[PDB]
Design a protein around this nucleic acid. Structure first.
Ligand SMILES: [Mg+2]
Ligand SMILES: [Mg+2]
Ligand SMILES: [Mg+2]
Ligand SMILES: [Mg+2]
Ligand SMILES: [Mg+2]
Ligand SMILES: [Mg+2]
Lengths: 78, 101, 51, 113, 269, 204, 467
RNA sequence: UUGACAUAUGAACGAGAAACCCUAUCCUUAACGGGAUGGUACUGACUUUCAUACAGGUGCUGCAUGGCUGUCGUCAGCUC
C-alpha cells in the first residue's frame, strides 16, 4: 500500500475533537504529534514549570510537542 | 478493602483495570484491522485514548501484601524479600528449605 | 484484581474490638497531656494566622 | 511380565514437597511405581533489610513426583473412580489419567467411504 | 390482638427473666391464627426468630473452664517438637483412613454373611437383561414373538375382542410356550477401536478448577478405517503432524473448549 | 453442696411452672390426639433443639455432596461415545419408570401402590434436591455448540448498511473468540454485543 | 553470616513442617492462608487477670480436596484445688412486627478467600429430617438383629462392618434424582440404566429371564404414537407391568449396600469429634414437654376448644407451638449445656468453611506443661512482662524451678530498656544446662516475642533443647 | 478537606427513596474529576448525608528501641 508506517502518529483525545481550536491556549500534552493541519498556530507547551511559547511552522510537522519546550535549564559552571 | 494503606492506590488501580479490560480489548481490536474504514479506526482510537490511565495494566505494580514494599517482590509469594526471609527461616513457608548444594 | 487478599481476622469482632480499644487507649493517653490532634480548621499555623 | 501396561488403566501422578515413601500406607494400591526426576527452584535474597549486598541467603523449592499405574478393566472404572475421588494422600496433589477404549460408529461416514 | 400489642408482649417476655408474658404471647398468637388476618406476618416472625443472630457472647472464664472440663491431658507427648509426626501417626492408626473398592466389597460380603445384607445376584441378573437382551435372545424367537404380538395387536384393535385381559392371557401362554421351547481386552460391539485419554486434577482447598482438566485426546489406527491409498494421503495432508507414521496412529487432542465433555465431543466431531 | 442443687431446682420449677395444668390439659383433649401432638413435638425437637450428632451427620452429608457434585470431577460412562447430536434428556418421571423393575427388585416394593407412593414422595422431594445441586454444581454449563451458534448469531446482526469489511471483521472476531477457552462465555457475548453496539452508532 | 534461626537448618530432617499440602496452581493462596490463619489464631482470647488464656503451642494444618484439618495444642490451666433456665437479655429487638441462553458461568478465584455465601445446612437438615428418618417399621427388625448380633455373636465384633459402622425417600431413588439433576445441569447424556451399576456389588430362574427379555423386546419396539388402532393395544400394553412387579417378596434387610451413603458414614467417622450434648438434649426434651403442657391450659383454652371444634385440622396448632418453642429457645440464647469452647470452635468452623469453600475440622489436644514449646514459653514471658509483677531474674528462676525433665537446656535473652533508671538499652542473657545450637541432630526450638511497654518495645528470645 | 481508608457517638431523609453498581451512553476537563441520560438490584439491630472524637504523615530522632544485618572472624578463643 501507499502507507510506509502502519501505525498512526499519536495525538491525545482532546485534540481529536476540536482540533486547532485547542491550539490557541496552554498545552500540557508533550506526547502528542504535530500534525500537518496544525501549521500557522501558536501553542504554549508545558515544560514542567511554565508554558513555553511555540509557533508551529512547516518544519515542526512530525515532531512531538515536547521537543520545542525544554525541561532542564542549560547550565553553566562558575 | 484490603487493609494495608500503602497498597490502596495499587488495589484501586487493579480494580479499575479489571473494570475496563473488555472495552480496552475491543478498541485495540478495532484499531488493529487495517481494512476497516478510517473514520471507525479514528473513533476507536479516540475511545481508546479516553480510557482512564489508571485503568491500564502498565500502571499496576506488584507490592508486598504484608508491608506494602514496591521493590524486590517475588510474584509467587506476593511478599518482599525481607518478609520472605523472615518467614522462610521460621519454617512457615511450605516447600521452602535452605539450599546447601 | 485478586492480588491483595482478604484478612480473615475481620470475621471476628473480638479482635477488631481489641484493636480499637488499644487505639482509643493510646488516643486518651495523648489527650490527657494535651498532645492530641488539634481541631480541624484550627491548626497551629492557622491559629497564628488568625492571631 | 515386566513390560509396559498398555490397555485400559488408571494412571496416578502424585506431586508433593515431601517423599510419598515417608507415608506409603496412604498410597492407593498399584501395579507399577515410578518416579520423576526432582526439580528445584533457587531463591537468593539479601540477608539485611538495608545495604549488605554481598551477604545472601539461598533457599530452594524442591518438587517431587511419583507415577502409579493401576491395571483395570472397563467395567471396574467408575467403581474405582468413586473411591479415588475421596482419597487423602498426605501433603500431596494427585492426578488421575484415564485410558479407556470405545468403538467408532462408521454408519454416518460409510456412504462417503 | 394486633402486631403492635404483640410487640409489647414479646419485648416484656425477652428481657425480664420471669415466665409471665408467655400466657399473653400464646393468647395473642392463638387469636391471630384464629382470625387469620395476619397470615403473612407469622412466617416472617418465624424467619426472624430462626435466622437472625442473637447475643452469643462467650466470656473468657466460661471459655477456659468449658475447655478444661472436656479435654483430658495427653500423657505421651512431653514436647511439641514432633507434633506433626503425632498427628500423622494418629492418622496412621485409622484402618479406614482411605477406603477402596476391595475393602468395601469385603465389608459388604461380611454384612451379607450375617443376614443384614442381601446378595445382589438377582439385581445384576435383571440389570444384565435390562442392558443386553437382544444378544441373549435367539434370532428366531425375536421374529416369533414379534409376529405373535402383531397378531395380538391386530385382533385387539377390532374392539369386539375385549382384549384388556384376553390379550394378556394369550401373550402369557405364548411366553410360557416360548420359555418351554427355549430353556430346554478390546472393546465390545464392532468397528475401529478408539483410544481416549482424560485427566482430573484433585487440588486441595475447595477450588477444584485446574488448567489440566479440560484436555481430551483421542487416538485411532488409520488402517482400521478402511480407507484407500488416495483417501489416506488426503487424510495425511489434512492432518499433518498429528498423524504418526511409525505407529500408524491418528491423534486428535481438543483443548479449545472450557469443559472436558465438550472437548470429548469436539474430538469425535 | 446445697446451694447449687437448690438454685437448679428453683430455676427448673420457675421454668416448668406448676404440673397441675399439664395433667388437667391431658385429660380434656384425648389420648390419640395427645399421641399425635407428641409425635409433632418430637418432630419439632429434631429441628428446633440443636444436636451435635445431627450437625455431624449434616457435615458428613455436606462433605459427600461437595465431593460427589463437583462438575470438575465429571467422568462420563466409560463404555459410551460422546453425544455429538446433543439430544435433550427425558423427564425425571420417565427416567424413574424406565428403571422400575430394577428398583422394585432392589428396594422391596410388594405391590404397585408402594411404588406409586415412592414415586410420589420422590417427585415431591425433587424440587429441593434441584436447589442443592444448584448450590453445589453451579448455575449451568451451556455446551460449546450452542455458545458458538449464539456467537455467530450476534455477528449476523452487524447493521445492514455497514460495509463488507466491517462484516468480515465481526465474522473473524466471532471466529477467533469461538476457539478461546480462556474467555468466559459472558465475556464473549458481551464483547460481541459491544462490537455490534459500536458499529451501529455510525451505520443507523 | 550472623547466628541464624535454629529451625531452618533442621527443617527437612529431625523436625517437620506445621503444614502439609501441595499445589502448583494454588500455591499462593495456601501459602498466604497458612501465615494469615496462624496470625489470626494466635490473637484469640488473650490472658486477662482472671483467665489463663488461649495459648497455642502448635497449629497443624493439613489440606485435602474439599477438606482441611486443623489440630490445636494447648497447655492445661495450672490451678490448685481444695443458669440456663433463667437467662434474659440474650435475645434482642423483634422487628418485622409491622438471558436464558446467555447465562453467567461459575465464578472462580485463585489467590485468596471467597466472598460471603448463604449456607445450605437448612435444606440438608430438612432433607434428612422429613425424609430418611429411619423410624419407618422396615428398619426395626434389622436394627434389632444388629443389636442381637452385637450382644450375642462374637463374629459381629472381629468384622470390618462392625468396626466401620461402630467405632469404639428410600436411598435408591434419591441418588437417581440427584444424578439426574447433576447430569442434566451439565448437559451430560444421562442414561438411568447405567446409573444402576452403582447399586450392584458383584464382588433355576431362567424362565423369569426369558419373560423379562421378551417384555423388554416388546417395550423397545413400540412407542410409535399418532395411531388410535395401536393406542387400543397401548391400553393393553401393560405387559411390562408384569415385568415391573415380578421380583417382589418379603424383605428382612436394611441396605447398607450401594457405596454412596456409606461414604456419608465414612466422612462421619472422622468428624464426630470428642464432644456431644445428647445427655443434656434428652433432659431439655423431657422438660420442655412438661413446660409446654403446663403452659397451655391456663383458663385461656376457649380459643383451643374453638380450634378443635372448627374442623379436622387440629394439627395446625403445631405451627403455633413451633412459634412458641422458637420464642422460648430464642429468649435463652446458646443451647442448654452446650460447651462454650466447642460453641466457639463451631463458630470459627462456620466462617472458615464459608470462606475457604471447604469442610474444616478443628480438633484440640490438651498438653501437660507450658514448657513443651519455645513459643509457649516466649508467650508466657511476654504476658508476665505485660503487667509488671516481677523482674527478669525471678522470671528465669521460676522457669528453671519447674523445668520438666525432657528439657536438656534452656536459654532466654531480654532486649530493650531493661532498667527504668537508664536510657541506654542492653541485652541480658540467662543460660541453663546445655544450649549447643551447632549440633544438627539435637532438638532445638526457638521463638521470639515482643513486649509493648510505656518506653518502647522489649524483646524476648527463647531457646530450649529437648532430648 | 471527618478526607483514599477505620471505629464510635448524636441528629436528618428513606418501608423501597436515595446513595451503590453496570455489557452502560453522551457532554465538558490537560487530567483526576465534574454534569446529564438509561437499566438492574438492595436497605430498618439496616443504608446514605451532616456534625466531632478523629483518620492520615517515606516528617525528626538508629544517640530512646524491637526485629534483621555487616565486621573483628571459621579467628580459636570467651567464661563459669
Ligand atoms: Mg506505614
Ligand atoms: Mg510495572
Ligand atoms: Mg519444570
Ligand atoms: Mg509526603
Ligand atoms: Mg547503632
Ligand atoms: Mg557497616
Amino acid at each position: 500500500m501507499s502507507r510506509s508506517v502502519w501505525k498512526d502518529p499519536f495525538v491525545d483525545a482532546f485534540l481529536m475533537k476540536k482540533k486547532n481550536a485547542a491550539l490557541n491556549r496552554k498545552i500540557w500534552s508533550r506526547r502528542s504529534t504535530i500534525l500537518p493541519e496544525y501549521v500557522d498556530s501558536a501553542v504554549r507547551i508545558y515544560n514542567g514549570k511554565t508554558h513555553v511559547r511555540c509557533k508551529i511552522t512547516e518544519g515542526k510537522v512530525g515532531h512531538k510537542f515536547g521537543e520545542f519546550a525544554f525541561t532542564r535549564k542549560v547550565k553553566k559552571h562558575a | 478493602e484490603q487493609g494495608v494503606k500503602r497498597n490502596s492506590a495499587d488495589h484501586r488501580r487493579r480494580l479499575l483495570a479489571a473494570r475496563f479490560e473488555l472495552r480496552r480489548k475491543l478498541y485495540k481490536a478495532f484499531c488493529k484491522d487495517p481494512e476497516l474504514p478510517s473514520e471507525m479506526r479514528e473513533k476507536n482510537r479516540y475511545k481508546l485514548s479516553k480510557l482512564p490511565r489508571n485503568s491500564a495494566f502498565t500502571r499496576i505494580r506488584n507490592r508486598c501484601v504484608f508491608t506494602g514494599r514496591s521493590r524486590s517482590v517475588t510474584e509467587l509469594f506476593r511478599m518482599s524479600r525481607i518478609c520472605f526471609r523472615g518467614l522462610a527461616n521460621k519454617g512457615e513457608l511450605v516447600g521452602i528449605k535452605k539450599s546447601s548444594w | 484484581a485478586e492480588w491483595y487478599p482478604y484478612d480473615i481476622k475481620n470475621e471476628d469482632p473480638n479482635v477488631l474490638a481489641r484493636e480499637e480499644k488499644e487505639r482509643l487507649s493510646k488516643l486518651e493517653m495523648l489527650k490527657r497531656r494535651n498532645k492530641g490532634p488539634p481541631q480541624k480548621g484550627h491548626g497551629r499555623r492557622a491559629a497564628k494566622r488568625n492571631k | 511380565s515386566t513390560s509396559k501396561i498398555k490397555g485400559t488403566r488408571i494412571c496416578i501422578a502424585i506431586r508433593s514437597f515431601d517423599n510419598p515413601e515417608k507415608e506409603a500406607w496412604c498410597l492407593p494400591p498399584h501395579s507399577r511405581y515410578a518416579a520423576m526426576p526432582d526439580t528445584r527452584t533457587l531463591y537468593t535474597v539479601l540477608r539485611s533489610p538495608h545495604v549488605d549486598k554481598k551477604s545472601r541467603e539461598q533457599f530452594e523449592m524442591r518438587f517431587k513426583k511419583r507415577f502409579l499405574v493401576i491395571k483395570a478393566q472397563s467395567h471396574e472404572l467408575s467403581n474405582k473412580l468413586f473411591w479415588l475421588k475421596r482419597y487423602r494422600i498426605l501433603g500431596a496433589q494427585y492426578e488421575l489419567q484415564f485410558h479407556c477404549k470405545t468403538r467408532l460408529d462408521m454408519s454416518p461416514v460409510l456412504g462417503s467411504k | 390482638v394486633g402486631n403492635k400489642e404483640l410487640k409489647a408482649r414479646i419485648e416484656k417476655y425477652f428481657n425480664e427473666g420471669n415466665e409471665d408474658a408467655l400466657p399473653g404471647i400464646i393468647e395473642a398468637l392463638l387469636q391471630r391464627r384464629l382470625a387469620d388476618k395476619h397470615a403473612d406476618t407469622d412466617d416472617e416472625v418465624m424467619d426472624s426468630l430462626q435466622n437472625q443472630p442473637f447475643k452469643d457472647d462467650v466470656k473468657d472464664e466460661d471459655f477456659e473452664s468449658d475447655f478444661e472440663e472436656a479435654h483430658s491431658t495427653d500423657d505421651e507427648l512431653e514436647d511439641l517438637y514432633n507434633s506433626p509426626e503425632y498427628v500423622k501417626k494418629k492418622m496412621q492408626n485409622n484402618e479406614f483412613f482411605n477406603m477402596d473398592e476391595k475393602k468395601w466389597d469385603v465389608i459388604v460380603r461380611d454384612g451379607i454373611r450375617h443376614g443384614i445384607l442381601k446378595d445382589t445376584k438377582e439385581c445384576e441378573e435383571i440389570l444384565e437383561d435390562m442392558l443386553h437382551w437382544d444378544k441373549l435372545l435367539p434370532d428366531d424367537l425375536k421374529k416369533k414373538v414379534e409376529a405373535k404380538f402383531n397378531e395380538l395387536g391386530d385382533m385387539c384393535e377390532r374392539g369386539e375382542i375385549e382384549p384388556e385381559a384376553a390379550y394378556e392371557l394369550f401373550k402369557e401362554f405364548e411366553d410360557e410356550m416360548v420359555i418351554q421351547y427355549g430353556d430346554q481386552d478390546d472393546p465390545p460391539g464392532k468397528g475401529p477401536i478408539l483410544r481416549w485419554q482424560s485427566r482430573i486434577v484433585f487440588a486441595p482447598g475447595g477450588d477444584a478448577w485446574h488448567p489440566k482438566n479440560r484436555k481430551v485426546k483421542l487416538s485411532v489406527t488409520v488402517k482400521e478405517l478402511g480407507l484407500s491409498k488416495h483417501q489416506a494421503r488426503r487424510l495425511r495432508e489434512l492432518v499433518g503432524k498429528r498423524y504418526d507414521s511409525g505407529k500408524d496412529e491418528l491423534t486428535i487432542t481438543s483443548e479449545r473448549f472450557e469443559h472436558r465433555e465438550e472437548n470429548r465431543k469436539d474430538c469425535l466431531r | 453442696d446445697k446451694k447449687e442443687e437448690e438454685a437448679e431446682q428453683e430455676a427448673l420449677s420457675v421454668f416448668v411452672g406448676d404440673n397441675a395444668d399439664g395433667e388437667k390439659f391431658a385429660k380434656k383433649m384425648g389420648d390419640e390426639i395427645m399421641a399425635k401432638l407428641a409425635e409433632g413435638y418430637e418432630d419439632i425437637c429434631e429441628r428446633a433443639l440443636p444436636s451435635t450428632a445431627h450437625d455431624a451427620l449434616v457435615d458428613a452429608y455436606d462433605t459427600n455432596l461437595m465431593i460427589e457434585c463437583e462438575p470438575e470431577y465429571l467422568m462420563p460412562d466409560f463404555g459410551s461415545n460422546p453425544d455429538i447430536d446433543e439430544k435433550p434428556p427425558m423427564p425425571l418421571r420417565e427416567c424413574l419408570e424406565k428403571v422400575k423393575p430394577f428398583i422394585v427388585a432392589l428396594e422391596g416394593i410388594k405391590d404397585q401402590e408402594e411404588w406409586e407412593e415412592a414415586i410420589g414422595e420422590a417427585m415431591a422431594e425433587a424440587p429441593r434436591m434441584k436447589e442443592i445441586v444448584d448450590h453445589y454444581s453451579g448455575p449451568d454449563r451451556v455446551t460449546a455448540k450452542k455458545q458458538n451458534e449464539e456467537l455467530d448469531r450476534i455477528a449476523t446482526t452487524v447493521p445492514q448498511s455497514a460495509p463488507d469489511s466491517v462484516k468480515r471483521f465481526a465474522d473473524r472476531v466471532a471466529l477467533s473468540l469461538k476457539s478461546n477457552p480462556g474467555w468466559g462465555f459472558d465475556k464473549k457475548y458481551q464483547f460481541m454485543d459491544k462490537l455490534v453496539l459500536e458499529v451501529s452508532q455510525n451505520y443507523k | 553470616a550472623r547466628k541464624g534461626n535454629p529451625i531452618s537448618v533442621r527443617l527437612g530432617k529431625n523436625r517437620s513442617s506445621d503444614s502439609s499440602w501441595f499445589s502448583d496452581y494454588y500455591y499462593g493462596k495456601f501459602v498466604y492462608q497458612d501465615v494469615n490463619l496462624r496470625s489470626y489464631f494466635g490473637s484469640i482470647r488473650p490472658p486477662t487477670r482472671l483467665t489463663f488464656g488461649f495459648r497455642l503451642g502448635r497449629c497443624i494444618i493439613l489440606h485435602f480436596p474439599k477438606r482441611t484439618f486443623i489440630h490445636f495444642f494447648l497447655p492445661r490451666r495450672p490451678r490448685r484445688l481444695k443458669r440456663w433456665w433463667t437467662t434474659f437479655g440474650k435475645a434482642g429487638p423483634i422487628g418485622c412486627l409491622r438471558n436464558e441462553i446467555r447465562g453467567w458461568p461459575k465464578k472462580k478465584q485463585r489467590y485468596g478467600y471467597h466472598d460471603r455465601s448463604p449456607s445450605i445446612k437448612k435444606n440438608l437438615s430438612k432433607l434428612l429430617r422429613i425424609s430418611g428418618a429411619f423410624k419407618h417399621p422396615k428398619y426395626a427388625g434389622v436394627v434389632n438383629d444388629i443389636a442381637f448380633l452385637i450382644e450375642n455373636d462374637d463374629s459381629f465384633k472381629k468384622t470390618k462392618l462392625f468396626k466401620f459402622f461402630f467405632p469404639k425417600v428410600r436411598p435408591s431413588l434419591n441418588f437417581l434424582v440427584m444424578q439426574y439433576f447433576f447430569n442434566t445441569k451439565n448437559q451430560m447424556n444421562f442414561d438411568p440404566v447405567v446409573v444402576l451399576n452403582h447399586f450392584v456389588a458383584p464382588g433355576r430362574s431362567l424362565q423369569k429371564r426369558i419373560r423379562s427379555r421378551i417384555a423388554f423386546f416388546v417395550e423397545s419396539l413400540t412407542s410409535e404414537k399418532k395411531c388410535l388402532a395401536e393406542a387400543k393395544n397401548r391400553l393393553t400394553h401393560f405387559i411390562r407391568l408384569a415385568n415391573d412387579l415380578r421380583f417382589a417378596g418379603t424383605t428382612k434387610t436394611t441396605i447398607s449396600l450401594f457405596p454412596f451413603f456409606g461414604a456419608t458414614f465414612f466422612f462421619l467417622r472422622d468428624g464426630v469429634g470428642v464432644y456431644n450434648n445428647l445427655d443434656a438434649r434428652e433432659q431439655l426434651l423431657n422438660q420442655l414437654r412438661v413446660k409446654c403442657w403446663n403452659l397451655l391450659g391456663k383458663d385461656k383454652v376457649m380459643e383451643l376448644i374453638e380450634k378443635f371444634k372448627n374442623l379436622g385440622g387440629i394439627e395446625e396448632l403445631i405451627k403455633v407451638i413451633d412459634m412458641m418453642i422458637e420464642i422460648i429457645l430464642r429468649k435463652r440464647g446458646i443451647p442448654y449445656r452446650y460447651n462454650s469452647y466447642f460453641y466457639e470452635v463451631k463458630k470459627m468452623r462456620s466462617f472458615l468453611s464459608n470462606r475457604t469453600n471447604t469442610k474444616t475440622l478443628i480438633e484440640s489436644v490438651k498438653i501437660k506443661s507450658v514448657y513443651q514449646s519455645a513459643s509457649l514459653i516466649a508467650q508466657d514471658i511476654s504476658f508476665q512482662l505485660k503487667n509488671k509483677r516481677r523482674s527478669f531474674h525471678s522470671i528465669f528462676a521460676k522457669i528453671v524451678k519447674e523445668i520438666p525433665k525432657r528439657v536438656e537446656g534452656i536459654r532466654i535473652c531480654f532486649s530493650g530498656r531493661l532498667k527504668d533508671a537508664a536510657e541506654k538499652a542492653q541485652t541480658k542473657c540467662y543460660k541453663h544446662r546445655k544450649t549447643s545450637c551447632n549440633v544438627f541432630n539435637q532438638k532445638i526450638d526457638y521463638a521470639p516475642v515482643e513486649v509493648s511497654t510505656r518506653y518502647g518495645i522489649l524483646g524476648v528470645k527463647v531457646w530450649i533443647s529437648y532430648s
